[PDB]
Design a protein around this nucleic acid. Structure first.
Lengths: 109, 108, 266, 220, 68, 136
RNA sequence: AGCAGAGUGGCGCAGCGGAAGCGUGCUGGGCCCAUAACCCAGAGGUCGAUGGAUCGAAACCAUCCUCUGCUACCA
RNA sequence: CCCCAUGAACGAGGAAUUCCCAGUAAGUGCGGGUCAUAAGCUUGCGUUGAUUAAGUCCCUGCCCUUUGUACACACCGCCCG
């Protein structure tokens, strides 16, 4: 992964990953709250420890998903997924799904 | 016929009729002597917003006004809102109000 | 490609979507009222009442009318809602959805022959032709279908701006095939109650004069439904030119028959 | 498809700013600012500017401390971008009026209709409260009904004497430090001590003609 | 007229944790210091596991928590 | 937008007329007199859901716009008048009373005074709901 | 004969310019200790003929036939 | 049990629902049991080895107190036209 990231763009390939984690962590999140036996939602904040855990989850789902019928190997898929996260461009599974949560959190707040 | 309370649950003594009051939550008719009365004194401003209002106010030391609300509950609304709780046979005879903070200073 | 004059929807506009997935938090859906751009519906703003079932409401493979609540112009997040929808809006949107489909099918014949190896082909045709047809008549409630419908019945509309080739035949054929046969609901209302025996020949003179100032060779549609009732479907235009043909003709038959004996219906 | 202009109406660039001046009896006379639309021949500036009310505090019109005794002032005349005011009646805040009312006191109230030396007519509303006394061990401060009706009678007697004589301006001068209310507090003290007297409202009911000469005296 | 003008990203830090709330204990009441004003403090509801002294990323401080 | 010709050391004082309670929040900024007025915004205009019209953030988002147009004109300070519904009703503020203040103050506008105003009868006509009142 | 409807893909009603539409039933599963209520899952297939536009036609539009509904006569 | 040939459904699964907090879950093999011949079962054992939580009474259920009862075959009870 790091090998492909370094050839492909040319950086200290850890700075890629650190941006990729920080850009994928949500700023606000929703949860459930029970009123009248019907679904209502409430916006709440998120821990830094939550952000890191979420951001690591999200991007790893991308490469797992892509290589499920592609000729491309998971290594290639994963290094592509850290680029599009490290520079936001919404071609990743992560930066999409990040913005979905925040778009909900605006609505019900 | 068993009598759960000596007072029948109201403050009627030496009187034939007492004017009804409307419950604040459910508008039900309740006798004024059976209604659960709560006086609520609150600042108009919430404690968090006091700083922002003092910084934006043209006056260096503005005394914030208070809301004075006399809430009138029926027995059902007062149990549902947990304003009054169920008590044991003996603890029903006690008429002491439950101790609050202490006093109206600072945190409460 | 785009089915609509603007590429991106606005704020508070009625649109149509087609469900492609069902989300936990609502419904992520593709548009077919614009590009195939993504728009997200949320669970809270679908109804104002409970919800027992869930697949007897929204499900995959359904056109659903909705209102665009917010849009991020730069990002391309089209926030969506189904909470404010009236059946009157559904009629208006179903028409615009259906009309865009037929108009884009007309603007597909153009692309069958021209260079269309890339998807953006139809986009090139759409912007240059569609906008000058519909923008001129969008404020009065017309779509680009009105402009094309006007061209088939009077050809100056599509000759006022760049005329394509081979398009014109298929354009004419598809306009004239689908939006006809083409029609008169003109029926005469005539009542007569003769005591005459010369009524049989009297009626013949009256029938042939349904339209004044026409040739003796004019073809018309005579209909006899009952003995006093004489229905003449007069010269078939659009029923906005044969109004005088319908109204004044009724006076002829009722007048001609009173002269030969007795009182009649007016 | 129109004239010049540009776009939307901006009804707030067709409006004209003004100033609002108080009587000379107030130390700070600069009340504030209002706006009306510019003159048209179908409705002129002054006709849409007169007959207003202007709530202003007492600790804001009289620098400075008191936080109530709000006064109403009406614009009776306009003079070249300065709107001159006239007394209309005073009122009181809610919270102060509420806080004084409490359990184990007996509230005492009365009003009178009264005329000035001039043509002004007023309708004053006062209030008294019983004192929680010097060194009670009792948890009540209730009074007899006979005692109350005396206190009400004597609260009218004082408030008619000082307002039937003494013209419009001198009335106002007595109410700003509250000399009126304080006079009642001591005069009723023997028959029950009492703490508090305020005049929660006054309502100017009728008033005489404009009288330009008498008008400009106030803004002299 | 179009969209909205919004405040910039704020940062505020924990001073103390108060207790857990929600209907499964999933929300946590917390007191936070504004990190630019040291006498300002707001109460919040925060989802994730927090300790004390860690910093959050608030999108607004208009919002304020109560209990439900 | 044309303001007055001085506001440099002084302020111009408007009245804010915040409305309180449920299913609705108004903010309606007016003159001192209240005879004429400026922009008027509701929480039903910011948020459409027919159920978040009384919410905190809907009241904050409202005042976050209204307070811009104030300073755009030249109104810089605000006296505040409250209104709960009253008239033999709930007579208690909604959620969006505390809310709008916190937002509009920190947007940059000054606060001059604050008070409670509510229409409270001295006993008046019978309240809707009947003898037994609402249940469920 | 004028007008109207239809000419099943389980039933009954036949929905619209995207190949079962609606309501119902039958059969099976789920929930429950169990039943009802409630929630899900089904099913060989130009939908009378002759044509046109169409990517396609019960359904987009015509030309014909038949059965019925209302009206009603040639015989 | 072995050898050659034949080459189907099935391309991630509705309504619902089970189990699990550290050498634990999951992946992976082995021994014992039954056994003349024979484990897709059960019982033990090693090997590789995560993510998520440090909570709560919302659902399901249980313990203690107070309260109400026309129930005691105990609400799956009882009972009305």
């Amino acid at each position: 992964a790091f090998e492909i990231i370094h050839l492909l763009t040319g950086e200290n390939p850890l700075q890629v990953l650190v941006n990729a984690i920080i850009n994928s962590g949500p700023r606000e999140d929703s949860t459930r709250i029970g009123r009248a036996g019907t679904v209502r939602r409430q916006a709440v904040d998120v821990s830094p420890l939550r952000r890191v855990n979420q951001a690591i989850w999200l991007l790893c789902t991308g490469a797992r998903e892509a290589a499920f019928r592609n000729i491309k190997t998971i290594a290639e898929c994963l290094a592509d997924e850290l680029i599009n996260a490290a520079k936001g461009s919404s071609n990743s599974y992560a930066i999409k799904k990040k913005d979905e949560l925040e778009r909900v959190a605006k609505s019900n707040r | 016929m068993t009598k759960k309370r000596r007072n029948n649950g109201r403050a009627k003594k030496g009187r034939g009729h007492v004017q009804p009051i409307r419950c604040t939550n459910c508008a039900c008719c309740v006798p004024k002597d059976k209604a659960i009365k709560k006086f609520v004194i609150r600042n108009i401003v919430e404690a968090a917003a006091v700083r922002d209002i003092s910084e934006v106010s043209v006056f260096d030391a503005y005394v914030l006004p208070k809301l004075y609300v006399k809430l009138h509950y029926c027995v059902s609304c007062a149990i549902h809102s947990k304003v009054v709780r169920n008590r044991s046979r003996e603890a029903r005879k006690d008429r002491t109000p439950p101790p609050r903070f202490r006093p109206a200073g600072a945190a409460p | 490609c785009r089915f609509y004059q603007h590429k991106f929807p606005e704020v508070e506009d009625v649109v149509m979507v087609n469900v492609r997935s069902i989300a936990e938090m609502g419904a992520y859906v593709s548009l077919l009222e614009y590009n195939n751009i993504e728009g997200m519906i949320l669970l809270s703003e679908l109804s104002r009442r409970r919800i027992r079932s869930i697949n007897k409401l929204i499900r995959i493979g359904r056109n659903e009318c909705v209102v665009v609540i917010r849009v991020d112009k730069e990002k391309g997040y089209i926030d969506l809602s189904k909470r404010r929808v009236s059946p009157e809006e559904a009629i208006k949107c179903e028409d615009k959805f259906t009309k865009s489909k037929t108009v884009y099918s007309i603007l597909r014949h153009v692309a069958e022959v021209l260079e269309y190896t890339k998807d953006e082909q139809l986009e090139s045709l759409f912007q240059r032709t569609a906008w000058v047809f519909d923008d001129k008549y969008k404020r009065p409630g017309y779509g680009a279908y009105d402009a094309f419908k006007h061209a088939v019945s009077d050809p100056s509309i599509l000759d006022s701006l760049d005329l394509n080739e081979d398009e014109r035949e298929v354009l004419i054929n598809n306009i004239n095939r689908r939006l006809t046969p083409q029609a008169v609901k003109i029926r005469a209302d005539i009542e007569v109650a003769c005591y005459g025996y010369e009524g049989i020949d009297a009626v013949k003179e009256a029938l042939r004069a349904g339209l004044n100032c026409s040739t003796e060779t004019m073809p018309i549609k005579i209909n006899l439904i009952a003995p006093p009732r004489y229905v003449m479907t007069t010269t078939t235009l659009e029923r906005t030119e044969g109004l005088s043909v319908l109204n004044q003709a009724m006076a002829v038959i009722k007048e001609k028959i009173e002269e030969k004996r007795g009182v009649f219906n007016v | 498809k129109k004239g010049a202009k540009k776009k939307v109406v901006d009804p707030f660039s067709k409006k004209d700013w003004y100033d609002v001046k108080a009587p000379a009896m107030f130390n700070i006379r600069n009340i504030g600012k209002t706006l009306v639309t510019r003159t048209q021949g179908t409705k002129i500036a002054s006709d849409g500017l007169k007959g207003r009310v202007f709530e202003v505090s007492l600790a804001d019109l009289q620098n400075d401390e008191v936080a109530f005794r709000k006064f109403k002032l009406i614009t009776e005349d306009v003079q070249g971008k300065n709107c001159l005011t006239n007394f209309h009646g005073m009122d009181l805040t809610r919270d102060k009026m509420c806080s004084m009312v409490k359990k184990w006191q007996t509230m005492i109230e009365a009003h009178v209709d009264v005329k000035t030396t001039d043509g002004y007519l007023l309708h004053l509303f006062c209030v008294g409260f019983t004192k929680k006394c010097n060194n009670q061990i009792r948890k009540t401060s209730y009074a007899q009904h006979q005692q109350v009706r005396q206190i009400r009678k004597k609260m009218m007697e004082i408030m008619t004497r000082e307002v039937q004589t003494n013209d419009l301006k001198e009335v106002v001068n007595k109410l700003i430090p509250d000399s009126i209310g304080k006079d009642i507090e001591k005069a009723c003290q023997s028959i029950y001590p009492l703490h508090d007297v305020f005049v929660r409202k006054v309502k100017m009911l009728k008033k005489p003609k404009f009288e330009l000469g008498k008008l400009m005296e106030l803004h002299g | 007229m179009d969209t909205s003008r919004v405040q910039p990203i704020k940062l505020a830090r924990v001073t103390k944790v108060l207790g857990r709330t929600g209907s499964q204990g999933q929300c946590t009441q917390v007191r936070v210091e504004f990190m630019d004003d040291t006498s300002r403090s707001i109460i919040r509801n925060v989802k994730g596991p927090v300790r004390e002294g860690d910093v959050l990323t608030l999108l607004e401080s208009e919002r304020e928590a109560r209990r439900l | 937008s044309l303001g007055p010709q001085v506001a440099e050391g002084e302020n111009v004082f408007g009245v804010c007329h915040i409305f309180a309670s449920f299913n609705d929040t108004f903010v309606h900024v007016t003159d001192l007199s209240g005879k004429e007025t400026i922009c008027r915004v509701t929480g039903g205009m910011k948020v459409k859901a027919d159920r978040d019209e009384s919410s905190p953030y809907a009241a904050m988002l409202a005042a976050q716009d209204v307070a811009q147009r104030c300073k755009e004109l030249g109104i810089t300070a605000l006296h505040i008048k409250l209104r709960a519904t009253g008239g033999n009703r709930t007579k208690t503020p909604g959620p969006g009373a505390q809310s709008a203040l916190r937002a509009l103050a920190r947007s940059g506008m000054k606060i001059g005074r604050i008070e409670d105003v509510t229409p409270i009868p001295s006993d008046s006509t019978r309240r809707k709901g009947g003898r037994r009142g609402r249940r469920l």
